[PDB]
Structure 1
Amino acid sequence: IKHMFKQKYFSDSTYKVIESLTSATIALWNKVKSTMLPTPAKFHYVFNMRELSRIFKGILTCKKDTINDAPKSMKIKPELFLVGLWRHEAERVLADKLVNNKDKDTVMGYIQEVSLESFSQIENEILEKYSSEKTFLFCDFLRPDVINEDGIIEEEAPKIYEAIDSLTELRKRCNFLLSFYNDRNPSKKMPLVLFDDALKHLLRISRIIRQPRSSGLLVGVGGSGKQSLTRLAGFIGKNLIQQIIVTKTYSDKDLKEDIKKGFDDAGHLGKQVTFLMTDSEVKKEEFLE
């Protein structure tokens, strides 16, 4: 964190919150790990040090310029925005695992408690702005710079990590991206409606596909919007979707070739590739291994 954000570029107040981030997340982590315990059900709940890795991975992907630009674009102090970023990234690692809505509300408390005590200087300005009800979400694709007149003629949108204030402003962008996806993939139509929770999930999936060396595991009862949102996120992400084709002839050998073509796309030539798996696509347990 000290190497990635330097003292020179940032204001004296902003860099006091940067130093606090590293001390903060640990205070939160300890409170979260001591209250949410692993059990037969909710077995994943257990928090490791990968979950501390991943929190930061989120914070360090959000660029220096975007934090200094916060007073212009987000109409808030840069020091405040930075805690806004932290809160989101802590949430996306710790809150997203949690299975029921009651266990989320408990953790949202521990994010708020900590924030207020770690960032004492901007406590009164944090407290009024940041709640579990109000939405301060982050994405890479926010920028509408992709006009898409006869394909992508006007360069591409710089994939920068920004904040969005309202879901309604987000919905217009995401709705346009969905309608465009149906135009580009005309064989496989994806009729879908993006409600408040569905938008959040799409950001959550588009975050996991974006970060380097990160895989996503989406757990839902089925028809919960898992597949549909993944193909959208992938399309918005401008990365290739690979889906296992299940036929009786197809076996463990053909999977290995389908994975091999994945590495042939990814490791070789340098294409971002998102391999997609469902319960349906796992014919046997050996494929999943």
Structure 2
Amino acid sequence: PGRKPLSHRFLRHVPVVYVDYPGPASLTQIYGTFNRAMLRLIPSLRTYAEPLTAAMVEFYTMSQERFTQDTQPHYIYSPREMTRWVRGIFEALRPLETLPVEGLIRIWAHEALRLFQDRLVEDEERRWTDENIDTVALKHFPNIDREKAMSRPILYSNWLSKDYIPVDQEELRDYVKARLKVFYEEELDVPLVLFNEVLDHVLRIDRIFRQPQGHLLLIGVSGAGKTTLSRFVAWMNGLSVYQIKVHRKYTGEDFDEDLRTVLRRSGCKNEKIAFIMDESNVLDSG
């Protein structure tokens, strides 16, 4: 979508090549190099670098086999997903030391859940993916104890303790309840009642915010709570919130200006910015 075929008068001069997604062998090699570099931080797991990488590649394969663009437009899959997978695993492993294979596979499964499961729509797809992750973990790691995969919460949060560590659902629920008490005590006077889904979403939003990424796009029905949770998480992590209040006579030069304002408040000043906006703000493809 949004692509126009080039004129034959211009295509005559320019040769073109088709750069397809790297094949299974290329993917295995490229991310095996990354895994072998990453796992050198803790020498206790070096010999498990080769299967883990393969597991990732294997998972990606069926994660590319189903979720075609016909089913849903956002069901796309590229090596960028594997890159974010490796980067997230490395980010979690960076401050922590002396980890057994238990923690490695636990965080591998957690990253798989956050990258290949939260984008899905219908429940059968979600349970299919969860079954796929646990089966693949058993296939390339049958020697491991079934103590990490069956863990149904499998949620991490650095809010408790001092680093990115697995946390029980109930204690995190109590902590986030206290923090949200403090939250709507200060602005957003409307009460916020927390179910399971909002807890999952605040954890995911915080995980995306913490990493040095560039965006976090939310897909869902109106009033479901995307914006309020975005603001709440921004309040947790000390993220300033910028809302562009568009109108009928709004011009793209204004969008360039406030983009530059966000960029200067984020880069020239180390203040971390969470700039939130919706469809009513977008008018043209510019």
TM superposition score normalised by structure 1: 0.80
Quick one: distance in 2 between partners of 1:198 and 1:47? 26
Amino acid corresponding to residue 141 of structure 1 in structure 2? W
Q: Residue 43 of structure 1: which of 73, 81, 85 is its match?
A: 73
1:177 maps onto 2:199 in alignment:
no
Distance change in 2, residues 1:29/1:64 (3 Å): same
1:88 maps onto 2:103 in alignment:
no
Q: Which residue of 1 aligns with 2:169?
A: 167
Shift of 1:85: 0.6
Quick one: distance in 1 between partners of 2:182 and 2:264? 28
Contact 1:241 1:276 in 2 (8 A): yes
Shift of 1:18: 4.1
Shift of 1:249: 4.8
Shift of 1:202: 0.7
1:174-216: CA deviations, max 9, x gaps?
1122122224x43x42521121111011111111111112411
Alignment of 1:140-289 (within 5 A): 140-143=158-161, 160-164=163-167, 166-183=168-185, 185-186=186-187, 188-282=188-282, 284-286=283-285, 289=286
Quick one: distance in 2 between partners of 1:36 and 1:263? 35
Distance change in 2, residues 1:232/1:48 (3 Å): same
Q: Residue 33 of structure 1: which of 64, 85, 88 is its match?
A: 64
Quick one: distance in 2 between partners of 1:140 and 1:235? 16
Amino acid corresponding to residue 182 of structure 2 in structure 1? F
Q: Which residue of 1 aligns with 2:37?
A: 3
Quick one: distance in 1 between partners of 2:137 and 2:53? 12
Contact 1:17 1:119 in 2 (8 A): no
Contact 1:59 1:89 in 2 (8 A): yes
Distance change in 2, residues 1:67/1:224 (3 Å): farther
Shift of 1:64: 4.4
SS of the residue 2:37 aligns to: coil
SS of the residue 1:275 aligns to: strand
Distance change in 2, residues 1:280/1:232 (3 Å): same
Shift of 1:65: 4.7
Quick one: distance in 2 between partners of 1:257 and 1:140? 35
1:26-47: CA deviations, max 9, x gaps?
01111221132220x4111121
Q: Which residue of 2 aligns with 1:115?
A: 137
TM superposition score normalised by structure 2: 0.80
Shift of 1:15: 3.4
1:53 maps onto 2:88 in alignment:
no
Shift of 1:135: 0.6
Shift of 1:96: 1.1
Equivalent pairs counted in the alignment come to 252
Quick one: distance in 2 between partners of 1:17 and 1:174? 36
Which segment is superposed worse, 89-98 or 239-248? 239-248
Q: Which residue of 1 aligns with 2:6?
A: none
SS of the residue 2:274 aligns to: strand
Contact 1:141 1:236 in 2 (8 A): no
SS of the residue 2:40 aligns to: coil
Quick one: distance in 1 between partners of 2:97 and 2:118? 24
Quick one: distance in 2 between partners of 1:234 and 1:16? 40
SS of the residue 2:215 aligns to: coil
Higher relative contact order (CA 8 A, sep 6+): 1
Query: Which residues of structure 2 form unaligned runs of 5+?
Result: 1-34
Please report the RMSD computed on the Cα atoms of aligned residues, expressed in angstroms.
2.1
Amino acid corresponding to residue 33 of structure 1 in structure 2? Q
Contact 1:244 1:277 in 2 (8 A): yes
